Ligand binder design. Structure first.
Ligand SMILES: *Cc1ccc(-n2ccnc2Br)nc1
Ligand SMILES: *Cc1ccc(-n2ccnc2Br)nc1
Lengths: 6, 222, 222, 6
């Protein structure tokens, strides 16, 4: 599950 | 960084990003925030990118160590060391947001940005906590950020979209609410889709990029 | 790290490598060396890998900053900051080798390894220096290491080969002797080739790996 | 020009 890479 | 000019701190933060010196970058942007002036859009991104990289490396190390720990006292001791370091970075960011970035943030763009950050760093704290109050602090920050973004920003706004993305990851990974996560990601993706026709080609690229992250998670979760 | 057991420092160095926490790894191995006992083959590699990663990131940042500098005072100031940090790491490694790793290293395997390290970290110092004595210190360390390896090790020994590789890079990049670099790389490659028939499959893999690095440089230099 | 990656 990916969050904002940022 | 009290003796360095605000502008010099900002310029050195940009240099440290180019040199992949993210601890330096975070230190420079911490000193910039502590000058007491509000942050511009670009300066907010520098602050976010700096700490996201620093804590991201800590989280990646913590997971390696926690995995070995699950599978003498050295492994636990060293995981505890990295855990303490991570919590210190998260506490420093939360302290900057509380003193005094959020209270001085009046525009929706700045306020949602800082509240999304606040939800993120309580989330990171929640990942290592053994806990309910920390999870609720993340939830409360994300919730206030969502309420503002849905009143004040178009559905395609990249900060609105990234906020919804991370809030959905919070629901899935932290709050044990996969159905809320799936529902938030789908509704966010659908409202953004319906609003793309209003965008220029460059705004269309910003928005469809994050929308794809929403889709990637939905493919993983369904 | 005076209060931690030698064995705990070694085990935590291995954990930090797995977690890509190379500053931690270097600190752990510095504390291990400062216990005063000689280092095993494996422990020497941990020491080398730890500092090579730390200084490698410093060198990469220094080159980015120096490139921008060549192309206010902030860029120079920050490059000077990274430069000072790099020199401090190099000085720390050189101090460990001088106190007292080299003087206690009697076997050819350990002595060549430490002298190759010493040539490497003077080389790194020479890369940022503005200088002749530092270059000669690197040359002298590499030279003593070569004289021992050619008397005491087979031509395919990986430490002998890596030593010759780095000494050739020294000739090319630092001492402005590209012809000596090409000559050293070719002769090292040819003697190793003629000695491969003596090796097991695993030793053959170790040696041919480094021989390929020699070939890669020769392709670049000719 | 490559040194030992190490
Ligand atoms: C929280 C966040 C951070 C960055 C972005 N963004 C802007 C442009 N591209 C991306 Br990814 N969105 C949201
Ligand atoms: C100086 C040095 C460092 C490492 C190695 N090595 C051993 C096995 N593979 C490699 Br690359 N050789 C020389």
């Amino acid at each position: 599950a990916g969050s904002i890479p940022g | 960084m009290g003796s360095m000019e605000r502008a010099s701190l900002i310029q050195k933060a940009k240099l440290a990003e180019q040199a992949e010196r993210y601890e330096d970058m975070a230190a420079f942007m911490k000193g910039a925030v502590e000058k007491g002036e509000e942050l511009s859009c670009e300066e907010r991104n520098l602050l976010s990118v700096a700490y996201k990289n620093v804590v991201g490396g800590q989280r990646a190390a913590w997971r390696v160590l926690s995995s070995i720990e699950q599978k003498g006292p050295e492994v636990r001791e060293y995981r505890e060391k990295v855990e303490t370091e991570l919590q210190g970075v998260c506490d420093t960011v939360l302290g900057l947001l509380d003193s005094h970035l959020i209270k001085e943030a009046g525009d929706a763009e700045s306020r949602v940005f800082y509240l999304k950050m606040k939800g993120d760093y309580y989330r990171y704290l929640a990942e290592v906590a053994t806990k309910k109050r920390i999870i609720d602090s993340a939830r409360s920050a994300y919730q206030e950020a969502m309420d503002i973004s849905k009143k004040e920003m178009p559905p395609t706004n990249p900060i609105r979209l990234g906020l919804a993305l991370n809030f959905s990851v919070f629901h899935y990974e932290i709050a044990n609410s996969p159905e809320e996560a799936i529902s938030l990601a789908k509704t966010t993706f659908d409202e953004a889709m319906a609003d793309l026709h209003t965008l220029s080609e460059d705004s269309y690229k910003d928005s469809t990029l994050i929308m794809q992250l929403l889709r990637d998670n939905l493919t993983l979760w369904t």
